[PDB]
Amino acid sequence: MMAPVQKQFREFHDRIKLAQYDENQTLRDERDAVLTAVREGLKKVFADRGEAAPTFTPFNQGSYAMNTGVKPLEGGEYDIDVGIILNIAKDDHDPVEVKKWIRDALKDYGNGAEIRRSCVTVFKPGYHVDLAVYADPELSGGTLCIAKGKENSGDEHRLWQISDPQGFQDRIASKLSGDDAAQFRRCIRYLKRWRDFRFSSDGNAAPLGIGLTAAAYWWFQVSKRTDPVSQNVTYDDRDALEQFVQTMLDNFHDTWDSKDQRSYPRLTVELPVQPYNDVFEKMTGMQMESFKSKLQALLNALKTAKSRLELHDACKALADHFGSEFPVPEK
């Protein structure tokens, strides 16, 4: 019979997983260090304006909130995502200015902050902290809005955009339960490691993380077998990946670009909560074309790894796409 690869996938998962905030004191302390720095820095920033400093409530975001986090490859960075809800009315402030408050509060913290379009990012050895900045729903008419725009942006691109990070997190947590949900999370992690191994450490692959998470929300399906007599359950991560990758490939659509006078294959993945935006929208057509090609190569490898006699060969085919922490037994 063909060599199975489930034990190797579970070993691979053990190597790449990074514990979520609730189980990771190091991440909680690094998060809280950035949060304490912003409180102190705001004291100083606003004593300088004759105004009382604003208060904020933080909340966990991203993969370390959703338990979909992976360890970076050597040289890569961890990504601590957090939301802060300032006690301010959105109609009374420009979003970029509010993010300036936060950046200035984190001037002399670590490697200094940086105002990015959707967050303030502070850099420290081996990780960065992505602070998404929101206005208070109570003071802003009932809705939760994130500060969009950077110092580069014109008036068209400075806005307070409706956002539902807790509804998104709830949907990821609630789609499945128990060991079904564990396999869902494993497969998200496997594809994040594939991202880090086969796409560059620049931001062209920056939307892959959230994109693959939202893709899995729409399209992942469990693969397990239940013995009709013993009721014993075994999971098949290789097959779950094969079905999911094939479904992603099925949803690419050839999309004409009038500027370039050609089509590019594009995968649109809507966020399942507000603002329902295509989380892959920033990827260029040429990057989409490369993404599709690499997903197809991954799919071909997943199929090859089903049909090898030797476990070494099945695992080698997988490690060509998942990298050198995918275990490959000797022949």
Ligand SMILES: Nc1ncnc2c1ncn2[C@@H]1O[C@H](COP(=O)(O)OP(=O)(O)OP(=O)(O)O)[C@@H](O)[C@H]1O
């Ligand atoms: N393009 C986007 N559209 C909507 N929400 C987004 C988008 N990008 C990020 N987010 C929100 O911000 C959170 C943090 O974004 P990030 O890019 O760090 O993804 P992640 O889920 O943490 O995955 P990774 O492990 O790759 O960091 C996301 O989980 C999501 O809630």
Ligand SMILES: Nc1ncnc2c1ncn2[C@@H]1O[C@H](COP(=O)(O)OP(=O)(O)OP(=O)(O)O)[C@@H](O)[C@H]1O
């Ligand atoms: N709705 C969102 N909520 C929270 N974080 C987000 C959201 N959208 C994007 N991000 C995150 O913020 C970081 C950068 O934001 P963005 O995607 O705007 O890139 P940028 O380089 O700041 O802007 P751009 O690339 O458009 O010039 C990424 O990690 C991304 O995942």
Ligand SMILES: [Mg+2]
């Ligand atoms: Mg993240």
Ligand SMILES: [Mg+2]
């Ligand atoms: Mg991030």
